[PDB]
Design an enzyme around this catalytic site. Structure first.
Site, mmCIF file in Angstrom:
data_model
loop_
_atom_site.group_PDB
_atom_site.id
_atom_site.type_symbol
_atom_site.label_atom_id
_atom_site.label_comp_id
_atom_site.label_asym_id
_atom_site.label_seq_id
_atom_site.Cartn_x
_atom_site.Cartn_y
_atom_site.Cartn_z
ATOM 1 N N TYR A 509 1.596 -59.969 -2.771
ATOM 2 C CA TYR A 509 2.586 -59.116 -1.915
ATOM 3 C C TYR A 509 4.009 -59.811 -2.424
ATOM 4 O O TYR A 509 4.331 -59.374 -3.293
ATOM 5 C CB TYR A 509 2.499 -58.943 -0.329
ATOM 6 C CG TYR A 509 3.182 -58.184 0.247
ATOM 7 C CD1 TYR A 509 4.494 -57.603 -0.304
ATOM 8 C CD2 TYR A 509 2.946 -57.693 1.761
ATOM 9 C CE1 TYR A 509 5.449 -56.833 0.350
ATOM 10 C CE2 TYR A 509 3.941 -57.088 2.263
ATOM 11 C CZ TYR A 509 5.182 -56.786 1.766
ATOM 12 O OH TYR A 509 5.852 -55.963 2.640
ATOM 13 N N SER A 592 2.536 -52.143 -5.335
ATOM 14 C CA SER A 592 3.703 -51.745 -4.634
ATOM 15 C C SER A 592 4.731 -53.114 -4.955
ATOM 16 O O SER A 592 4.802 -53.573 -6.273
ATOM 17 C CB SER A 592 3.646 -51.576 -3.230
ATOM 18 O OG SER A 592 2.810 -51.084 -2.755
ATOM 19 N N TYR A 593 5.455 -53.925 -4.140
ATOM 20 C CA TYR A 593 6.062 -55.185 -4.419
ATOM 21 C C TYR A 593 5.248 -56.228 -5.209
ATOM 22 O O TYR A 593 5.711 -56.906 -5.937
ATOM 23 C CB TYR A 593 6.696 -55.817 -3.156
ATOM 24 C CG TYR A 593 7.817 -56.852 -3.414
ATOM 25 C CD1 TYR A 593 7.566 -57.938 -3.835
ATOM 26 C CD2 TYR A 593 9.182 -56.263 -3.176
ATOM 27 C CE1 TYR A 593 8.663 -59.012 -4.289
ATOM 28 C CE2 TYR A 593 10.177 -57.016 -3.524
ATOM 29 C CZ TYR A 593 9.958 -58.311 -4.079
ATOM 30 O OH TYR A 593 11.033 -59.168 -4.072
ATOM 31 N N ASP A 670 3.183 -40.094 -6.732
ATOM 32 C CA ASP A 670 3.747 -41.085 -5.915
ATOM 33 C C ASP A 670 5.080 -40.712 -5.545
ATOM 34 O O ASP A 670 6.071 -40.774 -6.500
ATOM 35 C CB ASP A 670 3.534 -42.275 -6.456
ATOM 36 C CG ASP A 670 3.752 -43.519 -5.708
ATOM 37 O OD1 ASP A 670 4.585 -43.336 -4.498
ATOM 38 O OD2 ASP A 670 3.248 -44.710 -6.061
ATOM 39 N N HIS A 702 1.229 -42.948 -3.260
ATOM 40 C CA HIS A 702 1.395 -44.342 -3.219
ATOM 41 C C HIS A 702 -0.004 -45.316 -2.749
ATOM 42 O O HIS A 702 -0.214 -46.215 -2.962
ATOM 43 C CB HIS A 702 2.475 -44.805 -2.318
ATOM 44 C CG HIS A 702 2.935 -46.261 -2.615
ATOM 45 N ND1 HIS A 702 3.388 -46.605 -4.058
ATOM 46 C CD2 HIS A 702 3.081 -47.181 -1.759
ATOM 47 C CE1 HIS A 702 3.638 -47.829 -4.133
ATOM 48 N NE2 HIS A 702 3.381 -48.296 -2.874
HETATM 49 C C1 6AJ Z 1 -0.385 -54.672 1.971
HETATM 50 N N1 6AJ Z 1 0.881 -54.567 0.992
HETATM 51 C C2 6AJ Z 1 0.831 -55.493 -0.417
HETATM 52 O O1 6AJ Z 1 0.014 -55.884 -0.614
HETATM 53 C C3 6AJ Z 1 2.316 -55.193 -0.892
HETATM 54 N N2 6AJ Z 1 2.891 -54.193 0.015
HETATM 55 C C4 6AJ Z 1 2.081 -53.958 1.054
HETATM 56 N N3 6AJ Z 1 2.711 -53.379 2.201
HETATM 57 C C5 6AJ Z 1 3.854 -52.763 2.122
HETATM 58 N N4 6AJ Z 1 4.567 -52.266 3.318
HETATM 59 C C6 6AJ Z 1 5.721 -52.082 2.881
HETATM 60 N N5 6AJ Z 1 6.619 -51.584 3.630
HETATM 61 C C7 6AJ Z 1 7.524 -52.514 4.272
HETATM 62 C C8 6AJ Z 1 8.813 -51.946 4.556
HETATM 63 C C9 6AJ Z 1 8.707 -50.392 5.586
HETATM 64 C C10 6AJ Z 1 7.557 -49.620 4.660
HETATM 65 N N6 6AJ Z 1 8.233 -49.175 3.305
HETATM 66 C C11 6AJ Z 1 6.448 -50.428 4.328
HETATM 67 N N7 6AJ Z 1 5.942 -52.560 1.328
HETATM 68 C C12 6AJ Z 1 7.367 -52.509 0.707
HETATM 69 C C13 6AJ Z 1 7.223 -51.977 -0.656
HETATM 70 C C14 6AJ Z 1 8.115 -52.579 -1.367
HETATM 71 C C15 6AJ Z 1 8.213 -52.074 -2.787
HETATM 72 F F1 6AJ Z 1 8.695 -52.700 -3.619
HETATM 73 C C16 6AJ Z 1 7.762 -50.889 -3.209
HETATM 74 C C17 6AJ Z 1 6.862 -49.958 -2.122
HETATM 75 C C18 6AJ Z 1 6.812 -50.708 -0.813
HETATM 76 C C19 6AJ Z 1 5.980 -49.910 0.035
HETATM 77 N N8 6AJ Z 1 5.304 -49.333 0.692
HETATM 78 C C20 6AJ Z 1 4.755 -52.987 0.955
HETATM 79 C C21 6AJ Z 1 4.389 -53.707 -0.003
HETATM 80 O O2 6AJ Z 1 4.931 -54.149 -1.150
#
Ligand code: 6AJ
Ligand code: 6AJ
Ligand SMILES: *[C@@H]1O[C@H](CO)[C@@H](O[C@@H]2O[C@H](CO)[C@@H](O)[C@H](O)[C@H]2NC(C)=O)[C@H](O)[C@H]1NC(C)=O
Ligand SMILES: *[C@@H]1O[C@H](CO)[C@@H](O[C@@H]2O[C@H](CO)[C@@H](O)[C@H](O)[C@H]2NC(C)=O)[C@H](O)[C@H]1NC(C)=O
Ligand SMILES: *[C@@H]1O[C@H](CO)[C@@H](O[C@@H]2O[C@H](CO)[C@@H](O)[C@H](O)[C@H]2NC(C)=O)[C@H](O)[C@H]1NC(C)=O
Ligand SMILES: *[C@@H]1O[C@H](CO)[C@@H](O[C@@H]2O[C@H](CO)[C@@H](O)[C@H](O)[C@H]2NC(C)=O)[C@H](O)[C@H]1NC(C)=O
Ligand SMILES: *[C@@H]1O[C@H](CO)[C@@H](O[C@@H]2O[C@H](CO)[C@@H](O)[C@H](O)[C@H]2NC(C)=O)[C@H](O)[C@H]1NC(C)=O
Ligand SMILES: *[C@@H]1O[C@H](CO)[C@@H](O[C@@H]2O[C@H](CO)[C@@H](O)[C@H](O)[C@H]2NC(C)=O)[C@H](O)[C@H]1NC(C)=O
Ligand SMILES: *[C@@H]1O[C@H](CO)[C@@H](O[C@@H]2O[C@H](CO)[C@@H](O)[C@H](O)[C@H]2NC(C)=O)[C@H](O)[C@H]1NC(C)=O
Ligand SMILES: *[C@@H]1O[C@H](CO)[C@@H](O[C@@H]2O[C@H](CO)[C@@H](O)[C@H](O)[C@H]2NC(C)=O)[C@H](O)[C@H]1NC(C)=O
Ligand SMILES: *[C@@H]1O[C@H](CO)[C@@H](O[C@@H]2O[C@H](CO)[C@@H](O)[C@H](O)[C@H]2NC(C)=O)[C@H](O)[C@H]1NC(C)=O
Ligand code: NAG
Ligand code: NAG
Ligand code: NAG
Ligand code: NAG
Ligand code: NA
Lengths: 728, 728
Positions: A509, A592-593, A670, A702
C-alpha cells in the site's frame, strides 16, 4: 492428510467470518437482523422480541435492498431499485411503512431516483435529495416542502457531494446534517460549473451498438476545484404558501482569500453548530463555532470562538482535520490534534479560548474519540505494548487525567489485540469487536463497572472448520532503519521451516498514513498463496506510514514517490538476506497507491525483484484528483512543486523495466484512477521496447469487484506469480 | 553455418527490397528520385537530367513531405506540415514554386490545414478543399474562387469523403473530378447530419492532463447513412461571373426510392460524364451517362444511355461496380462484369444499347483494364496456367478479339508470375513490376513493338545478401474439396523434410474476395517463423475467396462466419493428413477479418487448434461499418438478416475458449474496428471464467503501425507462439 486454503476457497468464500452488526436505538436497546427478521434486544439481560417479521413484505413486489427504522420506532423506510454510482453514492426508490397502523403509506411518496434520504435524529421527519435539490417531510403521509430550487445535474449539488467531496472529503454522498433534536437542517451546496470533466467509454451489454461516453466533473491536480457554500434552514417554520428561507453561514476571511474546502460539520447543541474549513494548501484549517440568534433569526460565528489548526511539517489531520466532541452544554470540546512531539493526542478546548490542554501524551497515538460522558472520555489507541498495529479501548477520568483504564487490553490478550467499539445512546453499554490476531469476537459490556455481560458471536463454527485446514501463521515484527523502528508482517506458510528458502511476495500500500503491518485476522489472496503455494507474503510500513507520529508520517511531504518507494526496496533487501528467503524469487504487488509504488519499485533498477503486478496504479500525480494529491504534493506550478510532480512519474523509469517481468491491470470504467494512468505506462514501455503482460477489464471500476471480474483477476495474477516462481 | 532470417532482421529491415517508383509526366518522360535529387528520364534512350536539385529547398525552413508538378511542367506543389487522418485522408500546408522564374510564390497562398489539393489534368489550375468547402485557383499567384459555402466540420463535406466513403467506397479522401481538359470540376457533397458518432478516448503525450474524446460520424450496420449529392461547375466561367452555378446531377428514380450510394465517377469526354449509383441493398447498380447542354447550361442523362448492373447470387462488383473505360469519341466503353458462368470478363458496350459483347471468356478472371488505345486494350488477368494467384499483362486487338498476346507470361516464367503495370500518358511505354515468386524485377518496354528496353531494378544487391541466409521456401498448390480446387500456400522451413512433423501456424484473412494463396515474394513475420523457428506458415483460400468466379465468391452471401470459418478448420485437417504436421502444435492467427475468423475458429470446439492470436478483430457485425458489412450481410432487421447477425458473433462462443490458449490484441484509437469489438470479447470470456492473454496498444489505430508499436506487437506475438509450441 488435511486440505490447504485454496484459490477456490478464497474466490467462493468457503470459510466465512461471522459478524454481529447491531444498531443501538436507545441507551438500553439495539436492533439486530436474524433470519431476515429484525429483533430488539435488551442490553442488560440479553432477552429479545421480534420487531419486524420477514414475512411482512412477502407481497411487496420488489426486492428490498435495505431498511431504515425511524428513531421513534413508528416507521420503516424500505429501500429498493438500488443503482450504485461511486464509492458511497447511489440512487434508489423508497416506500414508508407505518409500524403502528400496519400499512404502507401510498400518499405523497418519496420519488424514484432519490439520491439521499435520512430520518431526523429524533422522531420521524425525513430529509431527501432528488434531482440535486433538498426536500423535507414533517410526516410520512404529508406533502414535501422544497428547500432548494438551484439543483442541476453535474453543476449544482444541494445536500449531496460531488465526485471529489464524496471520495476525498466526507467519505459519503450525503451533505445534510440535522441538528440534535431535528429543529434545523444544515447543508452544503457544491458548484462544479468550471470543473473539467473526465471522459471515458462505457461499453455496456453486447446489445449496445455505439459505446456511451461517461462524463464526470473531476478536478485533476492543479485544476479548477468545485466551490462550496453552507446553509441552515429551520424545519419547524416551513410553509405550504411560502418558499423556505435558508440562512447562509459564510467561511471566515482567512479562507475566502483563496481556494478552500468545507471539511467538517458537527452540531454542538440545539442552537450551536461547528464547522471546519481547510485551505487548498492543506496545512491551514479554521473552526468556526456558530450560535442561533432567536431575535434576528441569524447564525453568528464570533471571532473569539475561532480555532486555528495548522502544520509546519505537513498537512492538517490524518486525511482531514479531526472531528470535535462537544460536552452536554457545548461550552467545551475534545479533539485529536498532533502534539509538540508530532504524536496525535486528545486536546481539551474551551469554545472561547485559544490554548487547549492535552489530556493524553506519549510515543503512541489516539485513533479516535468514541464516547463522552460528564465523568469519562472513551477512546481507541495503539498504546498497549507499544504496538502501532494493535488497537484497544481506554477510558480517561475527566476530573483526573492520571487515571486512564484499558478496557479491552486484558480480556483475551492472545486472541484479541485489535478492537473497535459501538456505544449505546448515552454510553450506558458498549459492544466490543475484536478482529485479530485470532478469530473475530463480539462481546457486550456495561459501562458502570465495565462488566463483561455476554459473548454475542465467538466464531466457534469457523474455528471447528479451520481445524481441518493447514492454515498459514502471521509474524509481526520490526527492523531498524537509521535509529527508527519500522514494522512488518509476514504471512508464513503452514509448517514454516527457517532452514528452507521460500519465494517472497511483497504486498504493498505505502501511501501516506497507510498501515499494512497489523494484528488483524484476514482470509484473502495472501492466505491462499501462503497455505497452498508456500509463498511468504510480506508487508512493510516505512516512511509516510501512519499511527506512529508525524516524524514518520510527514517524511514524504511534497515528495511522493521517494522515501516510501526506497523503504519498500530496503525492506525487501533486508528480507532477501534472511536465511528463509529465496533471493532469486522476490516479487512485488499492489493496487491503487500500492500499484504506483510497485511500478516505481520495478522501475528503480534495484535488481532485488524478479517480477511484479500493478493493479489500477497512479502513474503521474497530475492525473490524480486535487484533494488527495495536493494534500501531499502542493500545486503543480513552477512557483510551487511542479519539478517534483514531473520527476515522480512511472513513465520516466520505463527503460529500467527491461530487467523485470511486469503485469499491468486496469478496469476501463475506473472513475477514480483513470484508465489513462495505465494507458500512459504501457505507451512508455512500448516506446523503449520493453515487453510486459497486460489485462484490461471492460466496464470494471477501481474495485474490479463484479463476481466474474474478481474471480478472473485473481486467477490471472495467480498464474503470473506461479510462472514467475517456477511453481507447477 | 549460414545465419537464419531472425525477428530483428524483420523488425529492423536488414534485408531491403529495392523499388523503382516513377512518375510519368508525358508520353515519353518520367520523374525518378536518386539521392534526394529529382531526375527526368527519357524512356526511349534511358538518358537523364536533373529536374530539381536536392539543395533547391535547403532554406525552405520545413521538411517537404511530398511534391506534385503541374501537368504543363510550369509549377511544383510543395506539401509540408503533413498530419495523417484516416487511411487516405490528411491535412497539410502547401507552397507553390514557379519552375521558370525559379521562385516561391508568396501571394494568395493555399491556406494552412488544407484537406485536399489537385492540379487540373492539363495546364496549371488548382482545386482545393479547406474547412469542408471547395476553392479553385486559375493561376497560382491569383485569388481563389469559392465554390461552396455549406461546409461544416463532421456535417457537410464538399469535395472530400466522410469516414465511410473514404474507407469503403472511393478508397480516397478526394471527392472531386476534373473534366479531361479542365473546363469542368465535378464534385460530390456528403451530408452526415443524422449519422451517429463513434466516440473513444485519445490519451496523447503524457503532458496532456485530461484525455480527449475523438468523435467521428460512422454508420454501424443498419444505422443512418450519409446522404449524397453530385454537382458540376464550369471553372472557365469563374473570372466572368460573381458566383458560378454548381449544376446538380440527380440520382435516377430507381435509386431515389430508398437509401443509395454514389459509387463511381468517370469522365467520358470534355462534355460527357458517367456516374454509377448503388442501392443500400448492394445487388443493384445504375450507370447514368450525362451530356452538357450548351443552350441551357444543364447536364442531361438520357434514359436510353442508362446501364443496369445487378446480381441474383450476391452483391455487384468485387467490392463495388467496376469503372468504365471510354473510347476516345465517348460513344462506347469497356467494363469488367460477371458473365453468365459467374466469371469477371471484359464486356464492350455502345452508350445507347443495353446488351454488351464479351471480348474475353474462360474459367479465369480479368483483374483490371490498364490502358485503351484506338487499336488495343491492355489488361491484367490470372489466365496463365490456370493459377488464380498469378497476374499477367495481356493485349487484345480491338479489330479482332481472337488476337490476344500475353506480354509478360514468358519474360521470366520461373522468377515472375505476379505483375502490375504503369503506362506512359498515351500508353507509348510501359513499366512492368514483377513482385514474385522470385525477387521483384522492374523493367521498361516500348508499346510500338513490345520490346524490352532495359532493366530498371533487379534487386541484385539483395540477392547477394540473401545467399548467406538460410531462407524459407514457398509452396503454392491446391486441394480438391467437393470436386472444387481450393488453393493454399505454405512458407516452409529451410531444408524442409517431409518425414519430420513440424508445428503449423494458419495465417488467415478469409474475408469476401480475399486471396492469401499467391505468387508474391514477401519478407515478413512468416519468413522469420519458418526460417528461425522452423514453423510451417500456411494460408488457405476457401469459400468466399476472390478471383475464381462468383460460385466461390458469393458462397458466403448473407452468411459471414459460416463456410469461410469451416473451410479454415478443414484446411488444417487436410494439412495434418499430409504427414509433415505435428497435430498437437497447430495454431491460427489473423488481423481484421482474419481476427474475426481466428476467434470464430478458436470458439468452434473443433479441437484442431492449440492456440491463436486475434489482432483488432470484428466480434459482432452490428459493430462494423454499414458499407462493408451490409454488402455481404444485408440489413440487421427481423424482415432481413437479423437472425444471422445475432448467430455469427464471437461472444456467443465464449464457453468453447476454455479448450484453447487465446491472445487478444487491439489499438485503443482504432477508428475502423472499434476497440469496443475486443472490449466485448474480453467481457464475454471473463463472464464464463475463461483465462486468456491480452494486450491493448495506447493510441494505436487499425494498423498498429507506429515504429515502436509494430516492433512491440510482433515481439509479444512471437513469445506467445513460441510458448504455445514449446520452443526455447
Ligand atoms: C487497501 N488499499 C491498498 O492496498 C492500497 N490502497 C488501499 N486502500 C485505499 N483507500 C484509499 N483512500 C484513502 C483516502 C480516502 C479514499 N480515497 C480512500 N487509498 C488511496 C488511493 C491512493 C491513490 F494514489 C489512488 C487511489 C486511492 C484510492 N482509493 C487507498 C490505496 O491506495
Ligand atoms: C491484409 N489483410 C488481412 O490479412 C485481413 N484483412 C486485410 N486487408 C483488408 N483490407 C480490407 N479492406 C477491404 C475493403 C476496403 C478497405 N476497407 C480495406 N479488409 C477488410 C476488413 C474486414 C473487417 F471485417 C474489418 C476490417 C477490415 C479492414 N480494413 C481487410 C482484412 O480484413
Ligand atoms: C426483556 O425483559 C424485560 C423483563 O425482565 C421486559 O421488560 C418488560 O417490558 C414488557 C413489555 O415491553 C412488560 O411486559 C413488563 O412489565 C416489563 N418489565 C420490566 C421489569 O420493565 C422487556 O420488555 C424485555 N425486552 C425485550 C426487548 O424483549
Ligand atoms: C416509481 O416508478 C414506478 C414505475 O415507473 C411508478 O409506478 C406506476 O406504475 C406503473 C408501472 O409500474 C405505471 O403505469 C404508472 O404510470 C406509474 N405511476 C403512478 C403515479 O402510479 C411510480 O409512480 C414511481 N413512483 C413515484 C413516487 O414517482
Ligand atoms: C456557480 O458558479 C458559477 C461560476 O463558476 C456562477 O456563474 C456565473 O459565472 C460566470 C462565469 O462562468 C460569470 O459570468 C457570472 O458573473 C456568474 N454569476 C451570475 C449570476 O451569472 C453561478 O452563478 C453559480 N451558481 C450558483 C447557483 O451558485
Ligand atoms: C429543539 O431545540 C429547539 C431550539 O432550542 C427548540 O426550539 C425552541 O423551543 C422553545 C419552545 O419550547 C422556543 O422558546 C424557541 O423559540 C424555539 N427555537 C426555535 C429556533 O425554533 C425545540 O423546542 C426543540 N424541539 C424538540 C422536539 O425538543
Ligand atoms: C504551507 O505550505 C506552504 C508550501 O510548502 C508553505 O509555503 C511557504 O511560502 C512559499 C510557498 O508559496 C515558499 O516560498 C516558502 O518556502 C514556504 N515556507 C516554508 C517552507 O517555510 C507555508 O509556510 C505553509 N504554512 C505553514 C503554516 O507552515
Ligand atoms: C536525352 O538525350 C536526347 C538526345 O541526345 C536529348 O534530346 C534533345 O536533343 C537536342 C538535339 O537537337 C539537344 O540539343 C538537347 O540537349 C535535347 N533537348 C533538351 C530539351 O534537353 C534529351 O533532352 C535528353 N533527355 C534528358 C531527360 O536528359
Ligand atoms: C443536411 O441534411 C439535414 C437533414 O439530415 C438538413 O437539415 C434539415 O434542414 C431543413 C431545412 O431545409 C430543416 O427544416 C430541418 O429541421 C433540418 N434537419 C436536421 C436534422 O438538421 C440539412 O439542410 C442538409 N444540409 C445541406 C447543406 O444539404
Ligand atoms: C453563391 O451561390 C450560392 C447558391 O445560390 C449561395 O448559397 C446560398 O447562400 C444563402 C445564404 O447566404 C442561402 O440562402 C442558400 O441556402 C445557399 N445555397 C447553397 C446551395 O449553398 C451563396 O451564398 C453564394 N455566394 C455569394 C458570395 O453570393
Ligand atoms: C475543353 O473542352 C470544353 C468543352 O468542350 C471547350 O469549351 C467549349 O469550346 C467550344 C469551342 O470549340 C465552344 O463551342 C463552347 O462554348 C465551349 N463550352 C464551354 C462549356 O465552355 C474548351 O474550349 C476546351 N478547352 C481547351 C483549352 O481546348
Ligand atoms: C544530393 O544527394 C545527397 C544528399 O541527399 C548527397 O550525397 C549528394 O552529394 C547530393 N548531390 C549529388 C549531385 O549527388
Ligand atoms: C419558489 O421559488 C421558485 C424558484 O425561483 C419559484 O419559481 C416559485 O414560483 C416560488 N414559489 C413561491 C410560493 O414563492
Ligand atoms: C501558416 O501558419 C504559419 C505559422 O503560424 C504562418 O506564419 C503562415 O502565414 C501561414 N500560412 C498561410 C498560407 O496562411
Ligand atoms: C437483392 O437482395 C434482396 C435481399 O437478398 C432480395 O430480396 C432481392 O430480390 C435482390 N435482387 C436481385 C436482383 O436478386
Ligand atoms: Na459475562
Amino acid at each position: 492428510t488435511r486440505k490447504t486454503y485454496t484459490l477456490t476457497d478464497y474466490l467462493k468464500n468457503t470459510y466465512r467470518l461471522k459478524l454481529y452488526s447491531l444498531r443501538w436505538i436507545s441507551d438500553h436497546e439495539y436492533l439486530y437482523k436474524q433470519e431476515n427478521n429484525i429483533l430488539v434486544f435488551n442490553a442488560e439481560y440479553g432477552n429479545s422480541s421480534v420487531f419486524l417479521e420477514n414475512s411482512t413484505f412477502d407481497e411487496f413486489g420488489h426486492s428490498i435492498n435495505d431498511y431504515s427504522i425511524s428513531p421513534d420506532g413508528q416507521f420503516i423506510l424500505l429501500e429498493y431499485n438500488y443503482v450504485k454510482q461511486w464509492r458511497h453514492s447511489y440512487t434508489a426508490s423508497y416506500d414508508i411503512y407505518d409500524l403502528n397502523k400496519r400499512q404502507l403509506i401510498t400518499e405523497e411518496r418519496i420519488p424514484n431516483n432519490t439520491q439521499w434520504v435520512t430520518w431526523s435524529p429524533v422522531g420521524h421527519k425525513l430529509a431527501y435529495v432528488w434531482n440535486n435539490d433538498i426536500y423535507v417531510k414533517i410526516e410520512p403521509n404529508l406533502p414535501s416542502y422544497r428547500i432548494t430550487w438551484t439543483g442541476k445535474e453535474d453543476i449544482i449539488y444541494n445536500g449531496i457531494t460531488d465526485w471529489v467531496y464524496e471520495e476525498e472529503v466526507f467519505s459519503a454522498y450525503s451533505a445534510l446534517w440535522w441538528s440534535p433534536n431535528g429543529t434545523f437542517l444544515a447543508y452544503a451546496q457544491f458548484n462544479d460549473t468550471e470543473v473539467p470533466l473526465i471522459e471515458y467509454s462505457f461499453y455496456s451489454d453486447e446489445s449496445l451498438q455505439y459505446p456511451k461516453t461517461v462524463r464526470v466533473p473531476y478536478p485533476k491536480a492543479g485544476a479548477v476545484n468545485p466551490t462550496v457554500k453552507f446553509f441552515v434552514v429551520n424545519t419547524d417554520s416551513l410553509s405550504s404558501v411560502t418558499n423556505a428561507t435558508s440562512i447562509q453561514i459564510t467561511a471566515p476571511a482567512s479562507m475566502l482569500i483563496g481556494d478552500h474546502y468545507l471539511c467538517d460539520v458537527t452540531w454542538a447543541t440545539q442552537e450551536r453548530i461547528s464547522l471546519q474549513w481547510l485551505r487548498r494548501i492543506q496545512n491551514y484549517s479554521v473552526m468556526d463555532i456558530c450560535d442561533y440568534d432567536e431575535s434576528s433569526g441569524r447564525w453568528n460565528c464570533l471571532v473569539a470562538r475561532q480555532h486555528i489548526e495548522m502544520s509546519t511539517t505537513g498537512w492538517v489531520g490524518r486525511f482531514r482535520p479531526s472531528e470535535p466532541h462537544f460536552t452536554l452544554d457545548g461550552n467545551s470540546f475534545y479533539k485529536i490534534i498532533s502534539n509538540e512531539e508530532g504524536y496525535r493526542h486528545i486536546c481539551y478546548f474551551q469554545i472561547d479560548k485559544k490554548d487547549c490542554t492535552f489530556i493524553t501524551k506519549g510515543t503512541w497515538e489516539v485513533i479516535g474519540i468514541e464516547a463522552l460522558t460528564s465523568d469519562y472520555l472513551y477512546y481507541i489507541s495503539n498504546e498497549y505494548k507499544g504496538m502501532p498495529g494493535g488497537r484497544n479501548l481506554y477510558k480517561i477520568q475527566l476530573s483526573d487525567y492520571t487515571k486512564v483504564t484499558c478496557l479491552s487490553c486484558e480480556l483475551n490478550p492472545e486472541r484479541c489485540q485489535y478492537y473497535s467499539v459501538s456505544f449505546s445512546k448515552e454510553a450506558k453499554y458498549y459492544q466490543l469487536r475484536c478482529s485479530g490476531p485470532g478469530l473475530p469476537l463480539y462481546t457486550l459490556h456495561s459501562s458502570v463497572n465495565d462488566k463483561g455481560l455476554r459473548v454475542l458471536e465467538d466464531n466457534s463454527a469457523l474455528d471447528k472448520m479451520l481445524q481441518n485446514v493447514q492454515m498459514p501463521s502471521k509474524k509481526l515484527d520490526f527492523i531498524i532503519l537509521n535509529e527508527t523502528k519500522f514494522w512488518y508482517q509476514m504471512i508464513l506458510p503452514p509448517h514454516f521451516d527457517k532452514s528452507k528458502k521460500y519465494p517472497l511476495l511483497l504486498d504493498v500500500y505505502a501511501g501516506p498514513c497507510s498501515q499494512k503491518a497489523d494484528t488483524v485476522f484476514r482470509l484473502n489472496w495472501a492466505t491462499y498463496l501462503a497455505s497452498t503455494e508456500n509463498i511468504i507474503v510480506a508487508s512493510f510500513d516505512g516512511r509516510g506510514s501512519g499511527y506512529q507520529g508525524d516524524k514518520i508520517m510527514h517524511a514524504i511531504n511534497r515528495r511522493l514517490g521517494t522515501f516510501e518507494v526506497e523503504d519498500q526496496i530496503e525492506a525487501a533487501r533486508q528480507f532477501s538476506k534472511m536465511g528463509f528467503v529465496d533471493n532469486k524469487r522476490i516479487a512485488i504487488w499492489g493496487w491503487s497507491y500500492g500499484g504506483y509504488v510497485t511500478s516505481m519499485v520495478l522501475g528503480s533498477g534495484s535488481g532485488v525483484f524478479k517480477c511484479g503486478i500493478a493493479v489500477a496504479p497512479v502513474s503521474r500525480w497530475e492525473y490524480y484528483d486535487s484533494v488527495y494529491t495536493e494534500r501531499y504534493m502542493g500545486l503543480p506550478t513552477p512557483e510551487d512543486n511542479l519539478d517534483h510532480y514531473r520527476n515522480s512519474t512511472v513513465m520516466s523509469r520505463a527503460e529500467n523495466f527491461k530487467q523485470v517481468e511486469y503485469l499491468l491491470i486496469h478496469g476501463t470504467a475506473d472513475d477514480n484512477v483513470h484508465f489513462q494512468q495505465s494507458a500512459q505506462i504501457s505507451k512508455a514501455l512500448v516506446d523503449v521496447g520493453v515487453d510486459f503482460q497486460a489485462m484490461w477489464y471492460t466496464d470494471e471500476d477501481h474495485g474490479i469487484a463484479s463476481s466474474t471480474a474478481h474471480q478472473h483477476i485473481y486467477t490471472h495474477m495467480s498464474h503470473f506469480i506461479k510462472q514467475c516462481f517456477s511453481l507447477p
